[PDB]
Amino acid sequence: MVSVNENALPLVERMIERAELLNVEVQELENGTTVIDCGVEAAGGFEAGLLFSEVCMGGLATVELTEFEHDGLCLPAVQVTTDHPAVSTLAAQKAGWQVQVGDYFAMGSGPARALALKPKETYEEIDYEDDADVAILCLESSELPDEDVAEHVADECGVDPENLYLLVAPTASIVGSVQVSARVVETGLYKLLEVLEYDVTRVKYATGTAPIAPVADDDGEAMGRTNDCILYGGTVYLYVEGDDELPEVVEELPSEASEDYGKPFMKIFEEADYDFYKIDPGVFAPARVVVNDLSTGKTYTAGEINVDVLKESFSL
């Protein structure tokens, strides 16, 4: 048993202690909730982005900087590694909490979801629930959350608001670029569970890479760019206790297994009438997967990096 909230706490404490170094701004709300601004008014940075990503993954993953170089496209990249794949990426990292309090809307991700159980079905499917007296949630938003947003999150997690920590950054920020690319492993795990209905607790180890998107000048375009890093630039290495249907599942895993594949996400979005429900959920996957079946010793691969679409997306 590992606690995603307890294992994320030391990283949060480090971010608070090193706030100036990280360009994050920390404030306490009147209910006692600590809000760590990582990109709304604060500048944040690469280091804030890496820690944000690790906090998001429940302290159960390492997220580090590396380089992406393919077909004359060179970018900074993240490298994500976890030995608790389902729990790190799905019990924590997945943005599965739509947080809406009054006039505030934001997608919430990170270990607090494992206390509030958002959504409940995920936790039943992977058989996980956290027991912790602290709650940590990451909010993707262009606005800092006020006291009643904090109160709501703290309440649903069953903790005192003094023991709630909220990390916040917009999509169009360097922390946005880093933290979204860091979910390259997660999107693979989520598609396995939700779309392909595979038992993701079979996935024992995981590591992956994805380029870091050039920061757009608004959150809408940044959503497209950061998604494209995964769909067209992401590679995931999975190590699985496999079965008979593993080879077929691997062929269905990459983003190219979708009919929506081929264009920058912004164009996929536009052609879907700006409606997420009209997009094939199977398109939200890594460009390239390499899967080692631990029970047979075999390796299955599917998908490719698509530098052309990345160049189109970033206007390069």
Next chain:
Amino acid sequence: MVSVNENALPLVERMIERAELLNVEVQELENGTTVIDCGVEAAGGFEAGLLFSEVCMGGLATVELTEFEHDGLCLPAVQVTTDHPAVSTLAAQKAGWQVQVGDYFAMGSGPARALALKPKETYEEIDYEDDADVAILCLESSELPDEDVAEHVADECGVDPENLYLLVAPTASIVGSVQVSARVVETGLYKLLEVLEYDVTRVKYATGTAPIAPVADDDGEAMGRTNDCILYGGTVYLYVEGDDELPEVVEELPSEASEDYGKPFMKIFEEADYDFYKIDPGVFAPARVVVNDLSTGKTYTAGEINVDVLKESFSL
């Protein structure tokens, strides 16, 4: 003077404290010996594999994750760096202790060898012996060692069994794949000393990389795969106080300098009647070496990465 056992201890203590996070299982035997299971019953992982490798290298090296990408073969890789090349890789890392107690057999590597002096000739040749009241040994085995194996190791090291730590993983595990690939620098140093009879204390700094093998379904095949990562996928950068015979030595260093080069190790093994003695010891070397002569400023290179043999080995 650096102690390989004292410098490895903090890493062992970290592994014990973070056992759940690492998927390692720690138990104390009746004589007081601590056994850290990193892959027999415990799952282990990448992080357990990296720490296992660093413990093996006496706390005198950094072993980190990176990526291997050549000719359409992309795998996770290790990057190994040490500023104590002979001591880290030969006084500690080398699997030079055949541990056999009753019905238990295992190859032992790591800093405990520098107390027990296994084999004695290596320590005379590099002029090193550890002085420490703790002993740490890594065992490559499909079975966890019992009390009398621990007692034997503790006795030969001259320490109380309460101050002995045993790390264990099979070849066919992710920790197996990581820790074997991490000896890419070591195999170069060992061949220099043993095969080419070079003074390896001339080697001042070293760094190297090797792909991490897809985990096989048995230890025998895993031995071949993990060896191939070094022989056909390994690159070593050595910085040497050189002499007149340095250029000739470098040409003889890579695995291709052997007549056994060209096929996956499993096939080299089969053609040698499954007898290690009938294999040319010069084949146990990195695919590619780059050697900087610190006294002349010159650089000598030899060997190449062989992606074809790697693909054959992993059935890709």
Next chain:
Amino acid sequence: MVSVNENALPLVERMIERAELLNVEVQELENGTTVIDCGVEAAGGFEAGLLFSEVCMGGLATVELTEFEHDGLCLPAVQVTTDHPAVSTLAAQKAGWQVQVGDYFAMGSGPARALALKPKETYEEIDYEDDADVAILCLESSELPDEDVAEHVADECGVDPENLYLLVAPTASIVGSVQVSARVVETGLYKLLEVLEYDVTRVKYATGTAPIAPVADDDGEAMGRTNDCILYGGTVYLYVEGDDELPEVVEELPSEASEDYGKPFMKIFEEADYDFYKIDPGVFAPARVVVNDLSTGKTYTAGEINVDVLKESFSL
């Protein structure tokens, strides 16, 4: 506000505590100044080189090992990342202090410059000055500094000599190779400010890579080699609050924008009558730049890695 001296101190303390592990030799002078030899008599190493580089950058950057592989040239490389670009690289890292006391000459770099203000113009231009009771300076020299050099540096920084720390390594050492390649980001920032007269406080985040030069057998050749790593092997990713002249500035940023571009620095130096003043200051820049305009979302690129000149430089 971040202090480059206070943030570098913990790294200095780590180097002193782990001196044996790092192959650095620490001594106290009679005025109380601590001198950390990282390559004159001490061997140093990769790890000493990485810490030296981070100390040099005021504890405001991460410098780690990675790999450089282009056109059949494979070398170790550094990866440099900072979220305080102007302060880390210009208030600290830049070798802007010509230290000359008696018969001792050395280029001084690192956070002590932010106390002594060397040169004063840089600190006025970026609006930065450190407030710290400790001073840390890195000296590139083939000789260890004696008491009166230490006294001079301590005096100009306004600190007691007991609170001064001097790190020393020659150009022709592995620490020399590492620490010079680590200024790949710095040379870009310096050219922006000094040559192109751009407001470098607009640069919000930065990351870059450069190969580590094979160590030459004298400091003169090592100067050429280590410079070539940046000029012909360096890539810098900058994230800027841009303006209207950003695209033109980016085209002027790489080393190829200079008429002196094309040959190893040793040959540029020889053709300039061994006079630094006859060399175009614009040639001291990264080979390749990738610049993300944070205000428009656009990315501008200029320059290329030149493996041919690197091979010529290292005689490969």
